[PDB]
Amino acid sequence: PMGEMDILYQMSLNHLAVIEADKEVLKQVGLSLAKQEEAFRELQLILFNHEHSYSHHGILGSSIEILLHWEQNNVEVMYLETKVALSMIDFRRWLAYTDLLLSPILPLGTTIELNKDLLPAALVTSMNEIGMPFLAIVLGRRLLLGPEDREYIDYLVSIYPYGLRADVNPIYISNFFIKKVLQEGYSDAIDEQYIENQYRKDYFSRNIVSEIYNV
């Protein structure tokens, strides 16, 4: 069912200097990325590593192809035989508010497996061994950075099975670090209401987005 987040998302699309016909396909690409978590993580990693090409076809929607022309500071997005040109700053802002308003947020206490390839080698070697999945527990969510609170980081996690220790400090991770969700934590209407009001509505009102986008 259509909800308040869809309204805020349309408002964010109205900041893009682009045609209504092109706003419509960016809306559909963003909704598709939001529903396919692994697809979005792949795109988030491509933007972070300054890769130039993205192609994904999940089990849900159509194929999404994006060419990131970093030298020209612009981007091409193609969905359903329709091609859209965006500046790089508009591309980052579009994905930022797609992530902010539409990406699922895991419950507290969720156990996840981290992608070893993306973690620093010193952390993998000291806190993990070969053949054991790098498991972690979600401790905090969308945490505000610095005194100015202009960006957030997706998760703060502890390393399983150690948890929070004086020796074992927790780890700030972005969502694309997550390889798998093993078991979700507890969540009820209180959590859903808090997430909607604080991590989406309030952040949107203050232009607070995830740090990986650098708008």
Buried-state track 129-144, b at ≥16 Cβ within 10 A, e below 16: eeeeebbbbbbebbee
Is 157 buried (19+), middle (13-18) or exposed (0-12) by CB count in 10 A?
A: buried
Q: Where are the beta strands (DSSP E) in the chain?
A: 53-56, 64-69, 74-79, 82-87, 111-114, 135-144, 151-159, 171-173, 178-183, 209-210
CB of 150 to Cl ion, least distance (A): 6
Q: Check binding of 200 to a second copy (CB under 8 A).
A: no
148 binds, among a second copy, Cl ion, none (CB under 5 to 8 A by kind): Cl ion
Q: Check binding of 44 to a second copy (CB under 8 A).
A: no
DSSP, res 119? S
* Cβ-contact 54, 46 below 8 angstroms: yes
- Could you say which of 5, 31, 124, 144 contacts Cl ion (CB under 5 A)? 144
Site residues for a second copy, window 106-125 (CB under 8 A)? 108-111
DSSP, res 106? P
Q: Check binding of 165 to Cl ion (CB under 5 A).
A: yes
For Cl ion, the closer CB: 9 or 203:
203
Site residues for Cl ion, window 114-143 (CB under 5 A)? 143
CA angle 44, 109, 213 (to 5 degrees): 20
In the shown chain, the binding pattern of residues 67 to 106 toward a second copy, with x for contact by CB under 8 A and - for none, equals ----------------------------------------
Q: Check binding of 180 to a second copy (CB under 8 A).
A: no
Q: Which residues bind a second copy (CB under 8 A)?
A: 108-111, 132, 135, 137-141, 143-144, 146, 156, 158, 160-166, 170, 182-183, 185-187, 190-191, 194-195
